[PDB]
Amino acid sequence: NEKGLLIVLSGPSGVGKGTVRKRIFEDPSTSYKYSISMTTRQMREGEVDGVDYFFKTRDAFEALIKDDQFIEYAEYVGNYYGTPVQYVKDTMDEGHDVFLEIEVEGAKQVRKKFPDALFIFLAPPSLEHLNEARKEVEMMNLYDYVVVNDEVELAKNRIQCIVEAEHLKRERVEAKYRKM
Amino acid sequence: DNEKGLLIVLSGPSGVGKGTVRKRIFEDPSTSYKYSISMTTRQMREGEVDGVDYFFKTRDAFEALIKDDQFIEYAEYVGNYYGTPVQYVKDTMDEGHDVFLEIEVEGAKQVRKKFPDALFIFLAPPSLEHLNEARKEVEMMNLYDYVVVNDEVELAKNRIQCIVEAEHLKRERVEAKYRKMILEAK
Ligand SMILES: Nc1nc2c(ncn2[C@@H]2O[C@H](COP(=O)(O)OP(=O)(O)OP(=O)(O)O)[C@@H](OP(=O)(O)OP(=O)(O)O)[C@H]2O)c(=O)[nH]1
Numbered sequence: 427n428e429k430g431l432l433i434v435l436s437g438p439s440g441v442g443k444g445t446v447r448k449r450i451f452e453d454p455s456t457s458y459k460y461s462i463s464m465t466t467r468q469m470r471e472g473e474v475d476g477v478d479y480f481f482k483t484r485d486a487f488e489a490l491i492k493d494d495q496f497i498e499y500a501e502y503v504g505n506y507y508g509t510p511v512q513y514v515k516d517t518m519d520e521g522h523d524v525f526l527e528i529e530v531e532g533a534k535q536v537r538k539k540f541p542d543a544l545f546i547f548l549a550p551p552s553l554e555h556l557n558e559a560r561k562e563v564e565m566m567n568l569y570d571y572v573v574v575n576d577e578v579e580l581a582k583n584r585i586q587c588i589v590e591a592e593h594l595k596r597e598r599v600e601a602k603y604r605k606m
Numbered sequence: 607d608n609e610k611g612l613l614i615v616l617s618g619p620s621g622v623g624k625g626t627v628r629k630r631i632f633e634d635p636s637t638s639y640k641y642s643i644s645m646t647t648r649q650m651r652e653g654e655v656d657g658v659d660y661f662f663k664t665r666d667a668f669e670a671l672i673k674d675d676q677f678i679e680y681a682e683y684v685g686n687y688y689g690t691p692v693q694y695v696k697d698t699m700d701e702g703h704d705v706f707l708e709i710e711v712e713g714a715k716q717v718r719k720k721f722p723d724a725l726f727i728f729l730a731p732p733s734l735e736h737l738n739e740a741r742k743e744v745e746m747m748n749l750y751d752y753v754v755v756n757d758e759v760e761l762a763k764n765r766i767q768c769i770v771e772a773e774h775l776k777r778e779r780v781e782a783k784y785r786k787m788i789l790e791a792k
């Protein structure tokens with residue numbers, strides 16, 4: 427039906443994707459859901475299970491990998507991080523747009539399962555001020571749109587526009603009227 | 607090579623208000639696009655100026671221009687010719703400026719044939735949203751990239767502006783700019 431969009435935000439480490447995502451979620455003009463990732467790293471002071479992350483053992487995470495229960499996962503410095511599939515599918519089926527915040531290479535995994543998801547790459551402003559740039563540009567080929575994080579407000583506006591445009595796409599709007 | 611401007615095509619059914627939305631778009635000083643001034647054979651109306659609203663032409667001259675392949679597209683609407691002159695569109699895109707067409711649906715089909723990567727926006731009546739007329743309107747949108755409802759002129763303008771902004775952020779376009787920058791530093 428009118429399933430919600432899957433919106434995938436990534437970019438190089440330290441680019442400020444968390445900060446931009448937080449700005450997007452402060453905007454009252456839209457209402458998004460957020461996929462809380464699973465991790466095998468230890469819970470740190472102040473963190474709460476099912477809020478910051480779902481904290482699991484390495485054996486549990488690997489059992490879930492085996493059962494195809496992640497849209498994407500990766501291992502960083504000995505700890506798994508990944509996106510549980512069921513929350514995403516259920517939330518989209520309820521009509522809600524859902525954001526994933528993932529690391530860059532994970533887009534290939536997501537696209538295999540959700541080829542029509544909206545992939546947004548957040549680029550550092552050092553690209554617009556201009557070797558390391560080659561690596562950053564190489565990362566982009568997995569994504570649909572590129573937004574420079576020059577200022578948090580401007581980046582948020584650009585992303586909101588991209589999402590609004592996605593809701594106006596003909597294939598989506600056409601299907602809605604056809605099915606009616 | 608040189609980064610070309612986008613070709614933006616606004617169309618949709620008779621009487622949906624393409625003219626009114628286009629007019630509002632070009633009253634906005636933040637609008638970056640260049641408007642393609644069409645040729646027509648219809649009579650000039652009170653308040654219109656030759657070379658602003660349209661380039662007004664005779665049927666003989668318009669038909670000679672058709673024969674010489676001087677239109678990206680032309681159509682007949684209510685017994686008059688309307689068409690988009692070719693050189694202005696090509697020159698303006700080549701200078702890196704986005705170009706905006708406001709045209710009827712038969713013309714838009716011809717543009718798609720020549721510019722398959724142009725941005726096609728279908729302006730829909732709010733009657734479709736409210737609840738045979740609908741089916742025909744849906745068939746008309748098949749070639750289009752986006753659908754914008756003309757519920758309010760200001761709202762339609764804003765949706766269009768966002769669509770064009772989003773297309774400027776497309777990775778293929780952005781990736782090609784950066785790949786070129788990196789290459790020409792060498
Ligand atoms: N193919 C083509 N069409 C053009 C071109 N220029 C203008 N048109 C269309 O020709 C139609 C008539 O234009 P106009 O003569 O200026 O008349 P209008 O202002 O539309 O009032 P009228 O139709 O007489 O009540 C419009 O479609 P609508 O009346 O449906 O628009 P809309 O959605 O705005 O109704 C225009 O979009 C062109 O270069 N090529």
Ligand SMILES: [K+]
Pocket residue numbers: 642643644707708709
């Ligand atoms: K026109």
Ligand SMILES: [Mg+2]
Pocket residue numbers: 620621
């Ligand atoms: Mg009209």
